[PDB]
Design a protein around this ligand. Sequence first.
Ligand SMILES: [Mg+2]
Ligand SMILES: [Mg+2]
Ligand SMILES: [Mg+2]
Ligand SMILES: [Mg+2]
Ligand SMILES: [Mg+2]
Ligand SMILES: [Mg+2]
Ligand SMILES: [Mg+2]
Ligand SMILES: [Mg+2]
Ligand SMILES: [Mg+2]
Ligand SMILES: [Mg+2]
Ligand SMILES: [Mg+2]
Ligand SMILES: [Mg+2]
Ligand SMILES: [Mg+2]
Ligand SMILES: [Mg+2]
Ligand SMILES: [Mg+2]
Ligand SMILES: [Mg+2]
Lengths: 173, 244, 191, 107, 203, 141
Amino acid sequence: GRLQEYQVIGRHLPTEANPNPALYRMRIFAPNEVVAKSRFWYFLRGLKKVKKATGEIVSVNVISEKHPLKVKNFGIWLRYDSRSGTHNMYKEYRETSRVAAVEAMYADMAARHRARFRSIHILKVVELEKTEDVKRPYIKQLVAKNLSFPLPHRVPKISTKKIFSAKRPSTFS
Amino acid sequence: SHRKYEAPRHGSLAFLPRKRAARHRGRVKSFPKDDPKKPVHLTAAMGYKAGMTTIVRDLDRPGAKAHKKEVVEAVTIIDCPPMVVVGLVGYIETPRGLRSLTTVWAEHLSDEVKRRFYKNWYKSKKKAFTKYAKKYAENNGASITRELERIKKYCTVVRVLAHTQIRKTPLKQKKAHLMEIQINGGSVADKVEFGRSLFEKPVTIDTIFEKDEMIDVIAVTKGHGFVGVTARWGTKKLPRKTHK
Amino acid sequence: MRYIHSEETIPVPENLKVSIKSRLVTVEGPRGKLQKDLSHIAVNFSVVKKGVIGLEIHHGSRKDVAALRTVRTIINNMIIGVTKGFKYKMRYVYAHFPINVNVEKNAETGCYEVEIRNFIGEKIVRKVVMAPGVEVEISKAQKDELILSGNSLEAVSQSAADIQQICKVRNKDIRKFLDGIYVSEKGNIVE
Amino acid sequence: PSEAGHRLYVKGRHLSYQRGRRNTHPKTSLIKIEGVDDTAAANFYLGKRVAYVYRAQKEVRGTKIRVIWGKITRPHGNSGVVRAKFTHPLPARSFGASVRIMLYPSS
Amino acid sequence: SSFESVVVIDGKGHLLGRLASIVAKQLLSGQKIVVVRCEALNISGEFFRAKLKYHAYLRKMTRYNPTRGGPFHFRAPSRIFYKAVRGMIPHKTARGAAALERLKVFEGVPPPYDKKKKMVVPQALRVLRLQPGRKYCTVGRLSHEVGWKYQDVVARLEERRKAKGAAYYERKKLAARQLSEAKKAAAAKVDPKVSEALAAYGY
Amino acid sequence: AEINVEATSWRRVEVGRVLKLENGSLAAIVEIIDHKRVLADGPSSDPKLATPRGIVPLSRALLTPIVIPKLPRGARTGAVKKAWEAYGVDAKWKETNWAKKQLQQERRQSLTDFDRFKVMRLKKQRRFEERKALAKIKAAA
RNA sequence: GCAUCGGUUCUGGCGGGGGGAUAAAGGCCCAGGGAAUGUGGCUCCUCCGGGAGUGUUAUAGCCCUGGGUGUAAUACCCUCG
RNA sequence: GCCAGAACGCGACGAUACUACCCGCACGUUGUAGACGUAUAAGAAUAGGCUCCGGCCUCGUAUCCUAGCAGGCGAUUCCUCCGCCGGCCUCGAAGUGGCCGUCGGUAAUUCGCGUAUUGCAAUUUAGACACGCGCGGGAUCAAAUCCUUUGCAGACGACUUAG
Ligand SMILES: [Mg+2]
Ligand SMILES: [Mg+2]
Ligand SMILES: [Mg+2]
Ligand SMILES: [Mg+2]
Ligand SMILES: [Mg+2]
Ligand SMILES: [Mg+2]
Ligand SMILES: [Mg+2]
Ligand SMILES: [Mg+2]
Ligand SMILES: [Mg+2]
Ligand SMILES: [Mg+2]
Ligand SMILES: [Mg+2]
Ligand SMILES: [Mg+2]
Ligand SMILES: [Mg+2]
Ligand SMILES: [Mg+2]
Ligand SMILES: [Mg+2]
Ligand SMILES: [Mg+2]
């Protein structure tokens, strides 16, 4: 859907034997904080022996892009489930924000590999600071010198309610 | 279960509707393809059948067993009294087929053709073409030469209307038969000029056909009233002890 | 993966003329004129330099870009053919029964026709009509040669294939019966 | 002189009744207004009055022409079709006929 | 939208089913339609698929009697378009029959329907929908390899009317010359203030 | 060996190319992201032509013949504004056919009934003298 | 049929308030540090458009960190009419 | 090639007594899947076109027509546009348009009389296709069936003939 970045802090309930337990922090992409907490408890149940009944949430915040008007390249590490077994990938994207990379990755994996939202794990998202660390060949072509291309055969827009035009259209906009 | 022993079907499904002709005189459906390099000529005739007889002749067939030997063959005789031309018709091509747009007749018509247009000729007034005849000798037939120019201008195929002389046969019938034969020739103008020049004149069959030529015959077969399947299609009869 | 820009160039020698209109190419030079229609492929033609023609495809897929070189090589073959022509050679191969042929001259039209007799000792007379613009000759340089010449490679080669395909052996082991007519060398009229 | 026409109404067409997929309700009708595409433009004709004119056989009170009166209730869909309510439901043979859109309740 | 007395659509370059859906909707709405040059429509996909589809259509026939009840396979391009439109209309009711009575279909441009303006529906043009490089066929050719007999008569007839329209175009070009020179000569000479008054009003 | 080819030629999408959005706005391309989206903005003193900074899909834009020369890639709003005023893009666009036609279009939707009657009468006044000249030339032939 | 009201309901516009990094960005100014899909120069080849190399703001500009203009504006959520 | 021919698919021609037919207008009992400016002719390409050879093309959001008692009566003004007829050319896919002439009407500019009362809305009863009638002009004076007969035909009808 339409996602945004959160940070969430959890804690085991303090007890007389172990007062002041440790604090854990993760970054979760979720449409809202109600499912952000659910994803926090889901990921934490696979790493530590803490549940929601025996845990608590300390703080939830929203992380916003520092420079949302600058173009940059991103790289995604992830896990998924196939029809038999699990696999690892590494993809790359070119855009202006971190959140849209996760939205595009979800749509891309859902289209090319038929992977739903239930069976996707995000390992790490990193912005490629240089230009010579781009690996995949479908992004290297977008950073070539003096990029320019025409747009042949693009259909003009005609109102969908105005039927019966009076002359043949043209595709030379 | 399947059929025990195989056998072909009885009769043919090509001639499936096995009914009486809609019209008594046989009807021709197709004519030879036109070629504009031969001179104008007719391509059909019509006559009455006299009978059959036997002939004897010698054979010229190299490599055969009966080569240069006498053979006996059966033949049929067709009476062919001369024909009379009465008129001409022109057709045009449309995205729906062929269609006729004009027709012109001769000045004088015989009582044989006039008998054909009536069902009770004896008590009629015989006014068939009385008003039609008077357009001749009026502005020198300008209407007629206008329609002839129309045929010379808009038409692609031309046929001619002719009839038989039933008065020269021993038949009791007095009403003649008329039909059209298309003229295949160099050009439409030549076709129309040749057809028009033959008005109310006789034409003999020797000008149309000639000896040892391969021709076609169209007619209506002999009729039988009402028959069973055994004679109509030719099926096997059931055993002698069959009931009903 | 959609490719933004793929381009190639074709040089043109200072002897002939070429004109393209609505994806219809006209090439004319010292040895004649040819026409070809390429309206089924989306290509953009341009004049790169004084004697170089450029053509390209934008936002094409791998399958679409694959066809780009095909027009380039066809146009280059036409350019060569209109200035130097084409020439194919053929040989007759028989073991016992000689095969005799008769390439009679023009039959009231530009087309030539070739008559083949006594193939594997057969009395069939087989008739072949050559494409227009192709000249067939019996060589005088030495024995057992058939000479094909012309302006267009497509017509010369197809006509040769017609000659090759018409001499076939049936109901026999073709590894033993090697009778037939086959092509042995292809080249230009000049040099 | 003065060859121009005389028109002070907008022409419309009678499309169908209000229906699901297998059930129809003759209570309200559907009208296609000329020149309207979106519901923002269709908002202008809310509350206006519509008329349906037809020819009868007999002479009754100085005329042979009858009328059925009604008014527009609310828009329908995204294509500018509108709903209407009449004093009597339409004769159900006029699926494709034309109606007149007046301009009486102005502003 | 607009309501005309009758509208004539030139069939060249429109997809069969996309044109037939618009036509069936206009017919049920109340418009009158006349479709011209039905031999120039298009079908998406390579020709062999259409031929196999038509052969599969041709294989259907009533078993006990082929003269009644059986699907009659019309062979004309206009009848193919008519079947396509008839499949989108409830033709078994009085309303459907009345809707179908407002439609006329022809091959070519008949003498009643030339000397007229031919409309275009922009939602069915091939050049705005299909991918360049894809394959398509022609309904006229498909009818040719299924038994249509009047392909050459219409093909030969059409250049005559195109030559007549060429002469009419020459007359129209000559006619434009007087109006074009007239506006330039008249506007300068006479009007002192109607010029900028019309310009300020947008005319 | 002169060669003449008459083939199409579109307008190139480089940096400095100015687009025209649907709602009468102009924007200059400063960065290309994909073949469907670009980063563009236009600083204009006129509030009708000004647009904010952001990404615009290429399916919602039209390519105008104006191009800003030597615009550095990824420049900020200050530098784009400096080149915009130095090149005079706003003044350059005013005499184009698209702007004049759009203005002549917009002036028509705002006409009072009295102005419609007046423009009809003035149109008849011009038509009367137009037909005299048309008849005069037609008679001369 | 119109004007003034009562109940239910659909659909437009305007004036404000609160919250988050007391939004994030962004404009102008100050201080420091860098690089290339290297600006202007310089060298070579190509005159045939131009290309190759050197090198950190000059006759273009970009990135990172801190501060002022700020209790800035705007987006989102909530809220008084 | 060949067989049947839609009994609600189509064309050409012959003769048509009973106002059966044709022409002119006079009203209107009566009918219609539904007028209210029912106004717009190139062809061809869509990775190219149009042209006045100067230029023009995303856009029919266009062009023409559009005032006056449902549109009167006169004048100053103006040679435009519209309509009925007549004569010559042209049009065959299901046959149409052009030119010339007579006649009738006519705000491009500016004026003089009359509009009320339908009473604060109630379709603006107005178009063109057929059809039934009434007049006054022109032309025309026919067939089919039953019946007797024939046998190239046949259960009876039907079919090929003759009177
Ligand atoms: Mg069995
Ligand atoms: Mg018998
Ligand atoms: Mg037998
Ligand atoms: Mg028994
Ligand atoms: Mg063997
Ligand atoms: Mg039936
Ligand atoms: Mg209320
Ligand atoms: Mg606020
Ligand atoms: Mg340098
Ligand atoms: Mg800073
Ligand atoms: Mg602040
Ligand atoms: Mg603030
Ligand atoms: Mg019949
Ligand atoms: Mg009577
Ligand atoms: Mg009477
Ligand atoms: Mg007059």
